[PDB]
């Protein structure tokens, strides 16, 4: 290791190809060949990946820990207040401003943000980075288990997604299908690549007024993969 050590610059790097391409350990060779990343051993660079996955999935445990036992007092003291209403000590079309049912929809609706510092880098999102991982995982390892020989011929089979019909181009099931095809070939956010391959036939459909742009694939995959997970239930 004479070519010295990781530091901030380094870190933001890494970061940024992760969400892109997930588990980077097998194209290492690759990042630094277009100047992606400088030159060091390969064992640094796999080091600090473990290191920065690792600790991403303890800010995750340790904030779940946390609201679950929130909720288990909460739901206690909901318990209390409903033998109350089915008595008529309080009665149901005139409950309190401020009452125990209100205050549990509150802390299970609530969406707050889970970040990390690293090696001098601020917040990091640990959510974002668990989730971009494993999405790209099942993707590759379902693609190579069912379509070897050609990837081309992935189908969805009678899972449905919801309708896009009032985007500007006509979108359905198939064009679904290849859009996962190009993330599986290109990265998630190469939506360019996508676009040009001229195999893959969505070319014209595509709008970097028109929709979709850049901001709907992204979301539109995000929900894809978390729906054939079993991520919606
Ligand atoms: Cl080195
Ligand atoms: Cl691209």
């Known amino acids: 290791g ?21 588990n980077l350990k097998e194209i290492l060779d690759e990042l630094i060949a277009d100047g992606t990343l400088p030159v060091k051993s390969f064992e640094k660079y796999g080091e600090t990946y473990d290191e920065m996955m690792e600790a ?4 995750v445990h340790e904030e779940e820990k946390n609201r679950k036992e929130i909720l288990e007092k909460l739901e206690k003291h909901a318990t209390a207040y409903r033998a109350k209403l089915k008595s008529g000590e309080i009665k149901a079309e005139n409950q309190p401003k401020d009452n125990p049912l ?12 889970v970040l990390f510092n690293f090696k001098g880098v601020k917040s990091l999102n640990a959510e974002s980075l668990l ?20 990837p ?3 189908s969805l089979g009678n899972n449905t997604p919801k309708p896009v019909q009032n985007w500007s181009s006509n979108w359905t099931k198939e064009e679904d299908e290849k859009l996962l095809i190009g ?13 040009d391959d001229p195999f893959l036939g969505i070319t014209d ?17 995000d929900y894809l993969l978390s729906f054939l997970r079993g991520g919606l239930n």
Do not use: M
């Not at 070939?185 to 996508?194: A, L, V």
């Open 2 to 22: 004479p070519l010295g050590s990781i530091g901030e610059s380094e870190v933001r790097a890494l970061y940024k190809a992760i969400l892109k391409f997930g």
């Open 102 to 113: 209100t205050r549990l929809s509150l802390k299970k609706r609530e969406k707050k943000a």
């Open 131 to 150: 989730s971009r991982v494993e999405d790209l995982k099942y993707l590759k390892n379902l693609i190579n288990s069912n379509y070897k020989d050609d």
């Open 152 to 154: 081309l011929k992935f």
């Open 183 to 195: 993330v599986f070939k290109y990265g998630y956010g190469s939506w360019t690549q996508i676009r």
């Open 56 to 59: 991403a999935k303890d800010c």
């Open 205 to 221: 459909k595509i709008f970097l007024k028109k929709v979709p742009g850049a901001i709907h694939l992204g979301r539109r995959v």
